[PDB]
Amino acid sequence: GDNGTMMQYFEWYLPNDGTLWTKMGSDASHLKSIGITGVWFPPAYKGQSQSDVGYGVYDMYDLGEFNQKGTVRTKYGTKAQLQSAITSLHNNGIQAYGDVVLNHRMGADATETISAVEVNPSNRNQVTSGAYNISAWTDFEFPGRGNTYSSFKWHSYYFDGVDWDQSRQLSGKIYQIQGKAWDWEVDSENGNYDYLMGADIDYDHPDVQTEVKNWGKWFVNTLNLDGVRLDAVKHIKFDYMSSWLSSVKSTTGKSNLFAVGEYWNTSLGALENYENKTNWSMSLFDVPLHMNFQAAANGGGYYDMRNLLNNTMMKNHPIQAVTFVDNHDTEPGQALQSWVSDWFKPLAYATILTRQEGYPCVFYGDYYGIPSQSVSAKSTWLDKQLSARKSYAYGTQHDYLDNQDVIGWTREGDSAHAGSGLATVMSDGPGGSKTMYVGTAHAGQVFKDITGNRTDTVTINSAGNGTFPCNGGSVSIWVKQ
Ligand SMILES: OC[C@H]1O[C@H](OC[C@H]2O[C@H](O[C@H]3[C@H](O)[C@@H](O)[C@@H](O)O[C@@H]3CO)[C@H](O)[C@@H](O)[C@@H]2O)[C@H](O)[C@@H](O)[C@@H]1O
Ligand SMILES: OC[C@H]1O[C@H](O[C@H]2[C@H](O)[C@@H](O)[C@@H](O)O[C@@H]2CO)[C@H](O)[C@@H](O)[C@@H]1O
Ligand SMILES: OC[C@H]1O[C@H](O)[C@H](O)[C@@H](O)[C@@H]1O
Ligand SMILES: OC[C@H]1O[C@H](O)[C@H](O)[C@@H](O)[C@@H]1O
Ligand SMILES: [Ca+2]
Ligand SMILES: [Ca+2]
Ligand SMILES: [Ca+2]
Ligand code: NA
């Protein structure tokens, strides 16, 4: 067993040129050489416009195959182009995880007149008006697809709520459809966080429950997926999501189907809750670790690096942790902007890539850069960290998370991977050394900094210890020369 490494193969500000699937296909053998074992690709189905990033879901049966919303292709390309890309990933032994967006729909084909009440955006449980008629965007007819793959049409009675009355056109409102209840169990911020945006799917209605589990089967079968990435799980009835996932595993026979959910909450408690209510059947993005990386990045050297891993899925539930530094939602100008500055980013990526805890995820925005926000590509130095992970980050780990500035850990090596073993050392502050145990096995061997940040070498004494230096505000990853 080789280490596993995910890559989010998109960012928010990609150009709308229908080329991402093409590119992903080409990149397959390159991704294999740098140690990517799995690729998370963005919502592949038709959004409300050609340029939609994917979260403005229109038709989940249109993988850029049908002419709807004025385009055949999605922002990313055609069903044909996606299938070639997935084949190419598979030919290079890389897993394909599809982004699955179940919370809502938008770009309804027409309005329906329906009775609804206003609820309080701070407390969706509290009603704030009498019933009355609104013009709600709840009619999904799918005219360019007709009945190919599914004749299921969405109407008002399949949604719990909307944020727009077309007849009166008012901001700041959340409408609950008459005789509907916000689903449960959901995140309890705003009393009930079932409603986020668009037309909120009612996961109480059992026609919806069995249609969405069919969609699941069709999606995973049609693209031959190894896994799913689940958008907005905090806003979706936990029991249904737990059964949605075991239904798809069962109906497809992919019973080892990988699943990671976006539960966006800075509190480990909330995440633990979601895991408990879903039988630990899926992993979660380590959002608390991301927040810690940001705090250290903005600490100007004064963050207490001993606390870097506190209150994280990485430390506390490593088998269900998907670790990340930044994503499409945290990048500059997006909704959860919490960017990790350039100087700290290598310390963060060294943390998720050289430690035994977590399934780490490399951001496309980091690897290839974000031109629209003047972010350099980090590919040159990331390649060296990914080399460390692929070929050296193996065997017993020893942790030295024991100073405000300088911290480190070692990996002894396993016999399965030749020459394997490393010592990672990093400082949020001035440069220094740590004496750490890499194993008596390595005695007399000479270590180099695979990052290139330092040109000196460390000789391992016969007790199996080295004294490993790093630069100020940098990281060095030491391996057998
Ligand atoms: O119209 C609704 C909303 O849309 C965007 O929000 C995007 C993100 O919403 C969720 O995250 C919320 C957190 O769960 C709350 O803790 C708090 O921090 O607020 C954010 C949203 O502002 C969701 O879980 C993420 O996947 C979404 O991308 C807009 O930016 C909001 O201003 C709108 O209210
Ligand atoms: O008729 C124009 C356009 O109106 C809507 O766009 C809304 C959106 O739905 C609301 O959720 C909110 O953000 O205000 C926007 C203001 O323009 C419709 O949803 C859309 O289908 C329609 O074409
Ligand atoms: O954390 C487990 C993951 O590790 C690796 O990428 C495997 O290839 C994948 O199947 C597994 O789901
Ligand atoms: O906190 C609000 C919640 O209280 C209870 O748990 C109800 O069962 C649920 O339907 C409601 O929204
Ligand atoms: Ca409901
Ligand atoms: Ca919802
Ligand atoms: Ca410090
Ligand atoms: Na709902």
Residue numbers in the entry: 4 to 484
Copy text verbatim from the article accompanying this structure deposition.
A ‘branched-ligand’ AliC complex was obtained through co-crystallization, with crystals forming in a new space group. This form diffracted poorly and data could only be obtained to 2.95 Å resolution. A subsequent lower resolution (approximately 3 Å) analysis revealed the binding of a branched ligand in the +1/+2 subsites with an α-1,6-linked glucose branch bound to the +1 subsite sugar. Weak density in the −1 subsite, largely diffuse but greater than would be expected for discrete solvent, remained unmodelled. Notably, this +1′ sugar overlaps in position with the very recently reported SusG amylase branched-ligand complex. The accommodation of branch points was therefore investigated by an analysis of limit digestion products (the characteristic oligosaccharides remaining after enzymatic digestion) on both pullulan (a regular linear polysaccharide of α-1,4, α-1,4, α-1,6 repeating trisaccharides) and amylopectin, an α-1,6-branched starch structure. The action of AliC on pullulan results in the production of the trisaccharide panose, glucose α-1,6-glucose α-1,4-glucose, demonstrating that the enzyme must be able to accommodate α-1,6 linkages to glucose moieties in both the +1 and −2 subsites.
Here, we report the three-dimensional structure of a ‘Termamyl’-like α-amylase, the AliC α-amylase from Alicyclobacillus sp. 18711. One particularly important subset of GH13 enzymes are the ‘Termamyl’-like α-amylases, historically named after an enzyme from Bacillus licheniformis. These enzymes typically feature a three-domain ‘A, B, C’ arrangement with a C-terminal β-sheet domain and with domain B being a protrusion from the (β/α)8 fold of domain A. The catalytic centre is placed in domain A, whilst the A–B interface forms the substrate-binding cleft. The fold, as expected, is a canonical three-domain arrangement with the A, B and C domains defined approximately as A, residues 4–104 and 210–397; B, residues 105–209; and C, residues 398–484. A classical Ca2+–Na+–Ca2+ triad is found at the A/B-domain interface.
